């Protein structure tokens, strides 16, 4: 029913586009859309602490633990809330996603309305790669296109 | 006592980046931040109805007229609810913003949080210089970076 808006911009052909499907204001959300001026292969894809993503790195870090574990999701089990998959793409330079998930709920000012999202430069573990690091981001790689979550309904 | 962080990119190294406080949640609020990637002089910088602005037109056109209203303010007596009127930039590329506003504040999705922002490469004409196109936008000359409004509380 609301329909909520992720506008992701990095460089001219870099962007990443998502809405958010939503019935109610609680209940779970039907997510898609596309990401583009990527190279074929995964990428990292998470909902980060706040809407901040203004003082470039000095802002989002890692991806927010809210419910106090690792990063995961569609290869681990325990995932933080701020993993909505990851986003592979095609050789016409795009991911075009499609989801369905009862981990968030369009609510107030802290779900994922008021939210960023960040898209990484590589393929993301999702869990336990081959070193530390790879449990706290993915080892997705460095970031290229930054967006903040809004309603469009 | 929420504070937001809006993100507008897309035209490569440019960006517009705003903040703001609340007080109180029917107050005055004053915004804040800066759009750098500019040339030197005025630019024009625009809220809007919703956070939609994926693609472009097609996620929304011009501020909004929810009044049924011309466009301006600081020179007209009309002015949208939901629009502010124009920045200038310095030689280094950026504008500083430190505005004070008693009609926008960070409550419901429809006033600053939850809604859109897109920044201008021209100065601003505010409801009427010339034309047509004055009374519609506010005759801004050009686009730069477009985003949604975040927060960091
Ligand atoms: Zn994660
Ligand atoms: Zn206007």
Same mark, same amino acid.
């Given at each position: 029913a609301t329909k909520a808006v992720a506008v992701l911009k990095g460089d001219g052909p870099?962007?990443?586009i998502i809405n958010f499907e939503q019935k109610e204001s609680n209940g779970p959300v039907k997510v898609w859309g596309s990401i583009k001026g990527?190279? !074929?292969g995964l990428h990292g894809? &998470?909902?980060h602490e706040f809407g901040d993503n203004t003082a470039g790195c000095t802002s989002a870090g890692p991806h927010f633990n809210p419910? =106090?574990?690792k990063h995961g999701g569609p290869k681990d089990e325990?995932? &933080?809330v701020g993993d909505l998959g990851n986003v592979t793409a095609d050789k016409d330079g795009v991911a075009d996603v =499609?989801? !369905?998930d009862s981990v968030?709920?369009?609510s107030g000012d802290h779900s994922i309305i008021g939210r960023t999202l960040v898209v990484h430069e590589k393929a993301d573990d999702l869990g336990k790669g081959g070193n530390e690091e790879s449990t706290k981001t993915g080892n997705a790689g460095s970031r290229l296109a930054c967006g903040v979550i809004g309603i469009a309904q």
């Amino acid at each position: 029913a609301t329909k909520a808006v992720a506008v992701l911009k990095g460089d001219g052909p870099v962007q990443g586009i998502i809405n958010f499907e939503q019935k109610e204001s609680n209940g779970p959300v039907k997510v898609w859309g596309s990401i583009k001026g990527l190279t !074929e292969g995964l990428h990292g894809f &998470h909902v980060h602490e706040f809407g901040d993503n203004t003082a470039g790195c000095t802002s989002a870090g890692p991806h927010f633990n809210p419910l =106090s574990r690792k990063h995961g999701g569609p290869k681990d089990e325990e995932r &933080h809330v701020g993993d909505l998959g990851n986003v592979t793409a095609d050789k016409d330079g795009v991911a075009d996603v =499609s989801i !369905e998930d009862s981990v968030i709920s369009l609510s107030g000012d802290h779900s994922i309305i008021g939210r960023t999202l960040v898209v990484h430069e590589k393929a993301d573990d999702l869990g336990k790669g081959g070193n530390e690091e790879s449990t706290k981001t993915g080892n997705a790689g460095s970031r290229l296109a930054c967006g903040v979550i809004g309603i469009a309904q």
